[PDB]
Design a protein around this nucleic acid. Structure first.
Length: 1274
RNA sequence: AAUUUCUACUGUUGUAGAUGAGAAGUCAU
DNA sequence: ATGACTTCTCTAACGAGCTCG
DNA sequence: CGAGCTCGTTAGAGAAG
């Protein structure tokens, strides 16, 4: 049970709303320029960061290159890594810490004491102080306007002279940058973070630079290669000027060599980005636009050394690639003109695209398509590939299914011809061990050798040979004339889409015009489908030449090589019409205020300028204007103490590490608080802390419990003297029972939150709104109306419990600050598409109602058709008792008293069902069992595989007229969200824990949506502030960190290994790990000799193969089987007509062993009759029998009929077909695919109810443990 | 086809569920 | 071209700096 | 020039598979 598992840790939601402009606020908002003069700010703030991160680049350009030389200590780090990468010892894993925290401090002390660093993260960046010049404009004007570096030209901003007009226009706005001057302290950081530029060099360039020099001098062994220092260094000459030197001393102008490279003392050259562009250039190889190919590189000599030997081990000493530096850069057609201008420019390349013979596409290619029609030329210069592309010939001209496509394989796979069988069933789970290269190729002479034998199989001599199709291009020049005739009809849609910044072609008004270009995309659409019939892919078997000539394939690449832009264009404007209309920017409203609502707090209300209100459960926002911002001071509230709205007194104490030593020990009020001798002594040297900083100008001494618990005693003598903070009613614990400073601030910030209500009369608000000294908005969604028949959302079941009375008894929902306001521009013209009162037809066919009346109108989507405000407002749930470390471990200690009580869930994947839960109790007897297609079971009961069953057939829409709007691209993710609720209502109600598939696409995004969707879980129609309510409710899972470190247990969703659950009988537990494969005739006979007795059931009427696995070596498991030949089993085949051909077990044997000299009706061992039999035709159709004597899952044309059968009997002597099963066994081919996860997981409650005193107990399953366990619940 | 936004709906100027937001950062099925 | 995954804050009050007093 | 004075810093605790 989970009834004691409430109130565990702190979250950070973001309740979002829409703001309704009430009174006449939006008259005033458009009266002054606060939206027109917005989004030239808030779309240049987001364009300011190409005038600051074009300065963080140029800063790192001169803090790591010329300077910051961590010289010769790299040899100290070289020694602590090569010896460490074999051995994990305390002699060196803590000396791994040595040059870890030495090189960074050798760097970061040069970072934090540098030239431009100090005046970078304050006001001195943009505009500093009166008379002085700030660093950025000093950089931009006095270094970059004078020294003209034309690098603003490579962006959307025109020049530097306009760029300065942005920078001056942020004067006064430099606390609107507390989200962007947060992500630059963590670029020059020095910490355990994966973000910095110092983590980049010290932890992910240097430890992958030691691997580069260790495998460079090993490459100097067996090195005869013509590396460019042996022949020519003019190639990498200007690229390797190298006016510095970090080996001995800097030389003016000499060019380095390969001796300088990979030196441990020359890594100081290879630190920043300007130099990873020279490390990974000598390794990489530069391009030259002087009619040159790619010049020679180091790993282009490991290919030039392989001209002498073809070693697989030759490539293992190549050069890797170091990463790119943080924030440096090298130096989705959503434009409506580019849909027409691309093909309009692409249409112009036909007359300008010429061949190699000095003629045009028509001036030379016209007569070339009418000369070799007799096939007199060498038509054997072709090379195909027999993987997927071979079916286009017979599927294009023969119109067959499994006849012409199966006549190339047997002649090609029998090259070396080591083989006897096929059809590999497992296949689980590995790719390769060392290497494997064999054995086949692709060409056209095998088509002459495999189809030419069938060319003479007809009666008459006018059949289909391999050479009777050479005249397919008799009008190759005239075929382009059809696309040219469809070019004159483009000026209308080009006139209809003449606007650039509109995106006004994929609207509903251009619905009929979409056939003007989608049907216009048919003249070049199908030709590209046939355009791949003149060039094979790179399916070469290590000798990809194929005898390429230049006679027949001379002018093909000169004209047809330019035809790939239709694949670029038609493959580029697919999602342009597919995409739904959103077309916004969703930009932050400021209301002319760098701090719009950082915090809703009373002493700083005239600078956040944002107030909330309450009137009869309709929640309000109030944004004051800045010029009138003291209009709710203490004066104008004592006057207007009337009745009307309510008003919010949100009083806050944030950062008790940052606050209580801010007021008590600073220059304004230290004398009134009067610190003593002993108490200021402690805070001088940080004596009350374990890692706390001292006052700067001291040194960190020891922690003392005596010099900490007396320092907590100071704080009970200065908060009470603070003029306001005495009113919180702090009630601390006794200072004998405070352990340190961490267990004291858990009783400051868990009480520094007071929320009271002081009434404001309505008539006072209406005056200042109409005058303009407020902006009153309304907090609104579906759940705030009188048209609320039933259940609310969660983002309104929360907001109605921020301001609640029962919230403020003891706070479990703390309003946070930091919030913003957003304004979305409109993108949809309102066209109604459902007029008044008429009959409207449904779309759910599971409905006891077929029509709809609807007096009013219903527009397509009323969201985007209205210019709406938006308000995002964070909270912090379980604010007073946060923490919950070791939360995987804490829920496991919950279970130990709770044995014999908690039932177990289970969830598959699939596409036959989509999931299949099964509530397994402690003893395998399942309680519930239901699918997840019919879900949403209130009374509507919609169905979900059936909706996919046409969107499984989605690959038809965008092909003809380029019109695909059918929602695969979001429905995938969205089905799972309904499931999340429905998993969860079972979890709590059945005292249930959850298992899953471990996964050691939307194939893990369900499991994503049960971690962060059981952070905190709340049932809407549960009793308020009762055991699972909205205040006190269920937190069961620790949050999501990664999918990788998700681990075996991320809460109560355990995991079991994915393999061997879907082929198992429930009552006994067989798996066919034995793989009958038929290598050869006698090479199967030793398998049949290993059986116990292949007798017959004269008493029953079916064969049986008694067997034990241990006489074969794999090894699977241990037990006397006696498998049988009972149930009717189905076999699929090549569908296209042939998808089901049912084969009986016993009838197929009695046809076959009776056909040979084997008599069997007596009923004893028939070993030596089979073992003595030695026919080619016998065993090939006998191992295939036992292949399908054990194929326990059977479809019919799966789906719609996919039941369960099972060979093996039991102690009852009974088999198991699913149609004669009771309820407490599985039912389908995914229900047995889920029930074993539902008892592989049951021993994860077998371990945890019996966990050691040693509290480590891993949750990994070895396969033999399960394979024994399931067989032995009996 | 109505939404704080997304999917699915008629569940009737909405019902049932879902929900963490901004701005950066590297990098890969 | 989407999914990965590492990081910030989720903020009141003091105090340098300011326009004048 | 002490009031004022509006906007930017600045006070800096703590578990670790």
């Amino acid at each position: 049970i989970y009834q004691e598992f409430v109130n565990k840790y702190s979250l950070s939601k973001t309740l979002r709303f829409e703001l309704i402009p009430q009174g006449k606020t939006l008259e005033n908002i458009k009266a002054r320029g606060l939206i027109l003069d917005d989004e030239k700010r808030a779309k240049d703030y987001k364009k300011a960061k190409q005038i600051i991160d074009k300065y963080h680049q140029f800063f790192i350009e001169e803090i790591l290159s010329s300077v910051c030389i961590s010289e010769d200590l790299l040899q100290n780090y070289s020694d602590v890594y090569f010896k460490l990468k074999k051995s994990d010892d305390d002699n060196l894993q803590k000396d791994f810490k040595s040059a870890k925290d030495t090189i960074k401090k050798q760097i970061s002390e040069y970072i934090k004491d540098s030239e431009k660093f100090k005046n970078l993260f304050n006001q001195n960046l943009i505009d500093a102080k009166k008379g002085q010049e700030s660093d950025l404009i000093l950089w931009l004007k006095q270094s970059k306007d004078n020294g003209i570096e034309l690098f603003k030209a490579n962006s959307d901003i025109t020049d530097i002279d306009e760029a300065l007009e942005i920078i001056k226009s942020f004067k006064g706005w430099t606390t609107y940058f507390k989200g962007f001057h947060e992500n630059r302290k963590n670029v020059y950081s020095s910490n355990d973070i994966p973000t910095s530029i110092i983590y980049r060099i010290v932890d992910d360039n240097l430890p992958k630079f030691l691997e580069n020099k260790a495998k460079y001098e090993s490459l100097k062994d067996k090195a005869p290669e013509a590396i460019n220092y042996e022949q020519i260094k003019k190639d990498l000459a200007e690229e390797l000027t190298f006016d510095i030197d970090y080996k001995t001393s800097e030389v003016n102008q000499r060019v380095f060599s390969l001796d300088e490279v990979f030196e441990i003392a020359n890594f100081n050259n290879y630190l920043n980005q300007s130099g990873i562009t020279k490390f990974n250039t000598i390794i990489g190889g530069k391009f030259v636009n002087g009619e040159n190919t790619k010049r020679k590189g180091i790993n282009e000599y490991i290919n030039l050394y392989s001209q002498q030997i073809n070693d697989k081990t030759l490539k293992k000493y190549k050069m890797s690639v170091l990463f790119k530096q943080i924030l440096s850069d090298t130096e989705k057609l959503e434009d409506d003109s580019d849909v027409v201008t691309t093909m309009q420019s692409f249409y112009e390349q036909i007359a300008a695209f010429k061949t190699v013979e000095e003629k045009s596409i028509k001036e030379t290619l016209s007569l070339l398509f009418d000369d070799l029609k007799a096939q007199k030329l060498d038509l054997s210069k072709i090379y195909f590939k027999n993987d997927k592309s071979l079916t286009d010939l017979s599927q294009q001209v023969f119109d067959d299914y499994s006849v012409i496509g199966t006549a190339v394989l047997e002649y090609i796979t029998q090259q070396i011809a080591p083989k006897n069988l096929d059809n590999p069933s497992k296949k689980e789970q590995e790719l390769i061990a060392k290497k494997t290269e064999k054995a086949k190729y692709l060409s056209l002479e095998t088509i002459k050798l495999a189809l030419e034998e069938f060319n003479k199989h007809r009666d008459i001599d006018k059949q289909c040979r391999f050479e009777e199709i050479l005249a397919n291009f008799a009008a190759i020049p005239m075929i382009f004339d059809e696309i040219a005739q469809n070019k004159d009809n483009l000026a209308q849609i080009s006139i209809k889409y003449q606007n650039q910044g509109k995106k006004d072609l994929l609207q509903a008004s251009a619905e009929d015009d979409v056939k003007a270009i989608k049907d216009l995309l048919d003249q070049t659409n199908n030709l590209l489908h046939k355009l791949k019939i003149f060039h094979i892919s790179q399916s070469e078997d290590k000798a990809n030449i194929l005898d390429k000539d230049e006679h027949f394939y001379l002018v093909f690449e000169e004209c047809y090589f330019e035809l790939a832009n239709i694949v670029p264009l038609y493959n580029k404007i697919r999602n342009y019409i597919t995409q739904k209309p959103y077309s916004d920017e969703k930009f932050k409203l400021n209301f002319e205020n760098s701090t719009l609502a950082n915090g809703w707090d009373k002493n700083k209300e005239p600078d956040n300028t944002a107030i909330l209100f309450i009137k009869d459960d309709k929640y309000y926002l109030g944004v004051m204007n800045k010029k009138n911002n003291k209009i709710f001071d203490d004066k104008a509230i004592k006057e207007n103490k009337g009745e009307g709205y309510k008003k919010i007194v949100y009083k806050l104490l944030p950062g008790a590490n940052k606050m209580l030593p801010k007021v008590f020990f600073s220059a304004k009020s230290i004398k009134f608080y009067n610190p003593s001798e002993d108490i200021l002594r402690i805070r001088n040297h940080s004596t009350h802390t374990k890692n706390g900083s001292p006052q700067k100008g001291y040194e960190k001494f020891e922690f003392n419990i005596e010099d900490c618990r007396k320092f907590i005693d100071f704080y009970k003598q200065s908060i009470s003297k603070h003029p306001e903070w005495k009113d919180f009613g702090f009630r601390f614990s006794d200072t004998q029972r405070y352990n340190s400073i961490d267990e004291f601030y858990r009783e400051v910030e868990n009480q520094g939150y007071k929320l009271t209500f002081e009434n404001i009369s309505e008539s006072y608000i209406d005056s200042v709104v109409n005058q303009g000294k407020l902006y009153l908005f309304q907090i609104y969604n579906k759940d705030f109306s009188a048209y609320s028949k039933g259940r609310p959302n969660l983002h309104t079941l929360y907001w109605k419990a921020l301001f609640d009375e029962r919230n403020l008894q003891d706070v479990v929902y703390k309003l946070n600050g930091e919030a913003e306001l957003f304004y979305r521009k409109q993108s949809i013209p309102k066209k109604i598409t459902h007029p008044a009162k008429e009959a409207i037809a449904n779309k759910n066919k599971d409905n006891p109602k077929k029509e709809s009346v609807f007096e009013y109108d219903l527009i397509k989507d009323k969201r985007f058709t209205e210019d709406k405000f938006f308000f995002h407002c964070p909270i912090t749930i379980n604010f007073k008792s946060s923490g919950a470390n070791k939360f995987n471990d804490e829920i496991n200690l919950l279970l130990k008293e709770k044995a014999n009580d908690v039932h177990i869930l289970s969830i598959d994947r699939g596409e036959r069902h989509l999931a299949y839960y099964t509530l397994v109790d402690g003893k395998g007897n399942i309680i519930k069992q239901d699918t997840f297609n019919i879900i949403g079971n209130d009374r509507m009961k919609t169905n979900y595989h059936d909706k996919l069953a046409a969107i499984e057939k989605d690959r038809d829409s965008a092909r003809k007229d380029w019109k695909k709007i059918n929602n695969i691209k979001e429905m995938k993710e969205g089905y799972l969200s309904q499931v999340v609720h429905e998993i969860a209502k079972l979890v709590i109600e059945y005292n249930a824990i959850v298992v899953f598939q471990d996964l050691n696409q939307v194939y893990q995004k369900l499991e994503k949506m049960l971690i962060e969707k059981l952070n905190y879980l709340v049932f809407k129609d549960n009793e308020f502030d009762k055991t699972g309510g909205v205040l006190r409710a269920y937190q069961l899972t620790a949050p999501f960190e990664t999918f990788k470190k998700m681990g075996k247990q991320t809460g109560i969703i355990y995991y079991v290994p994915a393999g061997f659950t879907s082929k198992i009988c429930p009552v006994t537990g067989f798996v066919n790990q034995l793989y009958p494969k038929y290598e050869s005739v006698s090479k199967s006979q030793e398998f049949f000799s290993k059986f116990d007795k292949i007798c017959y059931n004269l008493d029953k009427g079916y064969f049986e193969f008694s067997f034990d696995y241990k006489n074969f070596g794999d090894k699977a498991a241990k037990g006397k089987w006696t498998i049988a030949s009972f149930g009717s089993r189905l076999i699929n085949f090549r569908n296209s007509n042939w998808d089901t051909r049912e084969v009986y077990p016993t009838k197929e044997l009695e046809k076959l062993l009776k056909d040979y000299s084997i008599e069997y009706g007596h009923g004893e061992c028939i070993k030596a009759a089979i073992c003595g039999e030695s026919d080619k035709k016998f065993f090939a159709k006998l191992t295939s029998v036992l292949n399908t004597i054990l194929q326990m899952r059977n479809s019919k044309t799966g789906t719609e009929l996919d039941y369960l059968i099972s060979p093996v009997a039991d102690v009852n002597g009974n088999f198991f077909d699913s149609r004669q099963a009771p309820k407490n066994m599985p039912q389908d081919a995914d229900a047995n695919g889920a029930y074993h996860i539902g008892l592989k997981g049951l021993m994860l409650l077998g371990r945890i109810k019996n966990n050691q005193e040693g509290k480590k107990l891993n949750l990994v399953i070895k396969n033999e443990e399960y394979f024994e366990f399931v067989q032995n619940r009996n």
